[PDB]
């Protein structure tokens, strides 16, 4: 595959519906060596599992709200991998309450900073306990979504989390493209994991008439990770089908 | 004044460089009546100076970084200005280790929660707490730089959080539309105020041949405020004499 | 008002719903000296009568289809303008046929020049012809859509013409910055002028709740043409209410 | 390959230096079947030994600037391959006085014209004609460039043919992504085709510290024209290093 001898560490998958996941089916497809985390125990035996499925072993627990958690996995991760490639950053959250009606009454500062954390620092956080141990040709990714360019209903916080994110992407890769490190995202459409009614509009409006799915963007993600995607970097590739390049279809 | 009948609240005025300085004035100029705020003991006698000057006597106290102290100077403000319309945003801060050297080295969890929150969240908690303050046709104006779009060298961690803020411009807009409220920011190309090599740079690329001065910004943001901006929401104004609208000038 | 002293020409002007229309009458409001084209024989009435209406009898005939034309109309403000201070650009079109159905294959070969040629190349041949005739701190102004940005059904090949046109706009604002001019488009929402359920659509889902009005329209261009946007050039400001920066908001 | 089983037109090959050929090179070491078009007899000869290289006698004459050129050709292509999974528009072309000195005093009504026609209006002139040889899971590809999005010097209205390129892909996209069609293109940094201090200051400035070569682009084309792809449609797909989201690299 064109992943072949790449070694990419994956992180967030939760489930066989997780973005991840698909991510990692189809790079792990292409020949490269895969590596997991997983947020907590409840997870540890489950992720093990996904794991073996893709010849991997090396399944790893790593809290990025915490320095010292990414410090410890990728301490462990060293001493398999004193190098590897690049890896795949799928980590989005915000407390709950955050996510539903108007976004003015709904945000609070603690929504905000806890949003900002964990779905936007977390990856610069990640890409600065693990740059010293990236080969030339390493490549960083991150899952981003339409909401953090336009004002999406609901969305509220997780939107500017997303912008920030994008803005860490640029910056990401302006200061490590130097030491040849490539940095980009992907803004997916929306996709059924771990709401109806909106896949419904999307599917009805997107230009390939449906709504994109874990292996669409599986592939677009080892891409972007293999040296194909080699002039690329900074960028927020859209994998939605289209559906943010049109307008009124609806009506 | 093409804003008579007004009266906005103008957020940091720190002196007679600043950029919400010659907002104010402008402002003033157009015939509207203003509130000014003041963040700790060291600015208060600078503030009441320059508002005396521009016939206001409303000097209130306010640290964003604290939601009391928000609801406290809204409450001030509620004897003299039960409602109001708008107010603006000049607001901006990164802990001083983060702006200098590569990105991925300088920010830490601590300096992008500080900037994000100081930067960005800041903006909406005011929002917050004066929405029902707010008359119908009132509008909200905050700052922003290119660096939110684009990685620029040292500007690093603050890119991130004016992205996350110009987002929140589009959230705020979208949520309070429906109440009469407009919701823009000025991204204002580069101004010496509270750089020399990068100013010479940009007068000479930038299409009109020169940097931008706070009466530039100063008109702008008034018409932004005033009813004759009505049909602009959501909307992020380039006020930079067209510098980011070019490429290779330099050449 | 804040025109006072400006000389500016405006095209366009087809009748009280004419979007130059709104824009003509804000700028007189604000004070300015209008000068105005028409396209033919059918127009020169209509235009006479509302150019006596706002205080100007300068009438001129011009069909940006041909140079000769724009030379002549140029030469004929010579006599009474030796210099002003920019002009509206408020033309557009596509041959009828061009703007329904499925756009590759309503567009045509010839739809597709006419269009660009009537809609982008226009407004550079006009600046081209009074370049010389044009004061430091002149300003430019084109009217554009959200069609440039983004696939619209059955706006087609206008879409094409218009984003050619934005393009225009950046060129001609680093080409002319140097000599003191500036060169903005305002990227007006839809209007119904010289499409019912597309503005009930619009109405629902814009942030502030309503379509843009020939007035709000006519106020940001006043500005953009005024020495208040100083600051602006080669940008395009969205007044559509901030439709554009919403998503999913009929959900 | 990842484009076993694909037939692909692949037009613009002028030499071994073409961005045309690159990609055709990276398409054929993926298992695609290649067909070549050649604008005229000065090259024939020269255009069907890359063909052969190539495992291809596909090699078709053809002139975008004449509708009657591109039906024949396609006719011809029909007999051969009455259906085939899409093509790579490789065509870009002004009158040399365009592309010299100030913008405004190069550009003419006539090198508008036909650096629209032949750079934008092509692309969908092809899709056009051969609409109904589609299968589905087709891919349609054009080549755009930085000149679109920003003013860049002396690119002058080639920079408004991109834009309307640009937006081409968009409504393209929009129509044809119903019937299983997917139109992108890839916005290449500068390369040397049949200006070296321009790739000094780009090679500098790029994150990747280097211009991107024929081979980067020729990867991402044949990416985009596969179904590892299938996700993106109506996308402008940077490859450029990410040079164009960067800013002031150069102080
Ligand atoms: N599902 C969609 O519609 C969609 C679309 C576009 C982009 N995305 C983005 O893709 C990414 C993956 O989302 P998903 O849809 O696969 O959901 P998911 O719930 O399947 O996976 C996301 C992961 O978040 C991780 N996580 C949360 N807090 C964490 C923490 N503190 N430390 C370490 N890990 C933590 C969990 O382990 C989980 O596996 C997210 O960033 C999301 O915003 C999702
Ligand atoms: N000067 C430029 O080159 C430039 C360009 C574009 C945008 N901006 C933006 O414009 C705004 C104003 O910047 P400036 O150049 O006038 O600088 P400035 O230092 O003169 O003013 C900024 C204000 O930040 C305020 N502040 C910081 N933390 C605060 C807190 N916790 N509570 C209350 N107030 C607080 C200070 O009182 C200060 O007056 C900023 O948001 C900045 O990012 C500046
Ligand atoms: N109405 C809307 O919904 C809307 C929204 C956004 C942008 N716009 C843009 O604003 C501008 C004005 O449109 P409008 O809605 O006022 O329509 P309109 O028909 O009232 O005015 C447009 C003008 O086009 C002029 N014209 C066409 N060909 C010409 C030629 N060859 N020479 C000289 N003049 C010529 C006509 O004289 C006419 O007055 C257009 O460029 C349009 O694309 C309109
Ligand atoms: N070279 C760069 O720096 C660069 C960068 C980004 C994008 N691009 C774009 O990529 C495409 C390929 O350019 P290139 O650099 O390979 O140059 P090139 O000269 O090698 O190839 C371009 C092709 O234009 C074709 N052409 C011109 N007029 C034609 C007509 N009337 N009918 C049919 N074919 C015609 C020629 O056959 C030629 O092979 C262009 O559209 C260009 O704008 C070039
Ligand atoms: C793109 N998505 C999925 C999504 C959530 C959501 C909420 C409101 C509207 C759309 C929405 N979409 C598409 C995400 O990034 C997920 C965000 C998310 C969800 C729950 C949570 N606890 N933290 C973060
Ligand atoms: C736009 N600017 C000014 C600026 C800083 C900077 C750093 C690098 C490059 C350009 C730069 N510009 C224009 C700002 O927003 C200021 C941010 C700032 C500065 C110090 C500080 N302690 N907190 C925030
Ligand atoms: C913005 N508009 C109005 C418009 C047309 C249109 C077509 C489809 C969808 C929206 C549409 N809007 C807003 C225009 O620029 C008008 C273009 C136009 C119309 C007729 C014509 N003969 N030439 C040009
Ligand atoms: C990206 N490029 C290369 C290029 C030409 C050019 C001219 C001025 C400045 C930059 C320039 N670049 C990067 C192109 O699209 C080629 C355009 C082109 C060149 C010659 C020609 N006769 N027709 C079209």
Request: proline share 3%; hydrophobic share 45%; glycine share 10%.
């Amino acid at each position: 595959g064109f992943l072949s001898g790449k070694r990419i560490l994956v992180t967030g998958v939760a489930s066989k519906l997780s973005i991840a996941y698909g991510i990692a089916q189809a790079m792990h497809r292409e020949g490269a060596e895969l590596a997991f985390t997983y947020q907590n125990d409840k997870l540890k035996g489950r992720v093990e599992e996904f794991a073996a499925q893709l010849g991997s072993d090396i399944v790893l627990q790593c809290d990025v709200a915490e320095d010292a958690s990414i410090d410890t996995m990728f301490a462990e991760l060293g001493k398999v991998w004193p190098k590897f490639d690049g890896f795949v950053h799928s980590i989005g959250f915000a407390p709950g309450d955050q996510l539903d009606g108007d976004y003015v009454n709904a945000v609070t500062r603690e929504g905000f900073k806890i949003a900002h954390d964990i779905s936007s620092y977390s990856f610069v956080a990640m890409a600065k306990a693990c740059r010293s141990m990236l080969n030339p040709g390493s490549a960083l990714l991150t899952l981003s979504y339409l909401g953090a360019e336009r004002a999406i209903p609901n969305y509220n916080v997780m939107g500017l989390a997303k912008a920030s994110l994008e803005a860490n992407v640029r910056y990401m890769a302006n200061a490590m493209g130097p030491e040849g490190v490539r940095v980009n995202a992907i803004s997916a459409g929306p996709i059924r994991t771990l709401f109806r009614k909106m896949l419904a509009h999307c599917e009805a409006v997107t230009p390939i008439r449906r709504t994109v799915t874990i292996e669409d963007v599986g592939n677009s993600a080892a891409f972007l990770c293999s040296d194909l995607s080699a002039g690329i970097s900074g960028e927020v590739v859209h994998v939605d089908g289209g559906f943010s390049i049109a307008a009124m279809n609806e009506l």
